[PDB]
Amino acid sequence: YDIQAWKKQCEELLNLIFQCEDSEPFRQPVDLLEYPDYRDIIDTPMDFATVRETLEAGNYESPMELCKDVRLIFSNSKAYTPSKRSRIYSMSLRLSAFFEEHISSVLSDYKSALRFHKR
């Protein structure tokens, strides 16, 4: 029932994601010089360093907000990919599955703690 526990749990999940080779195209903003049409397709860019920095600045109120930004990294990859068989998109699918598998308990524990607090 620790209402604050989600923050360090998310910091540790982010460390695992940064060690995963599949995260490399998503660690920093998409290079607009390499993909000049990126902002014509994507309205809101997102990357793992921005998620980490937002978390570290104390600018997420809940793990649900962090989840929404991580999921935006994956929907952007799905929207920008020219093919569902592309290399970078194939990396985002695996990383999405890894993230969803690990974030489920963080969300569940946080929601459980809030419910206990409301009692």
Positions that interact with ligand 60P (CB under 6 A): 25, 30, 35, 77, 80-81, 86, 88-89, 92
The rounded distance, in Å, linking the Cα atoms of 8 and 36 is 36
Question: Of 35 and 116, which has the nearer Cβ to ligand 60P?
Answer: 35
Provide, rounded to whole angstroms, the least separation between the CB of residue 10 and ligand 60P: 22
Cβ atoms 62, 9 nearer than 8 A: no
Minimum distance, C-beta of residue 44 to ligand 60P, in the bound complex (Å): 13
Residue number with CB closer to ligand 60P (89 or 110)? 89
With beta carbons less than 8 A apart as the criterion, state whether 3 and 106 touch: no
CA distances (Å), origin 100, targets 61, 90, 93: 19, 16, 11
Q: State which residue has the least CB distance to ligand 60P.
A: 77
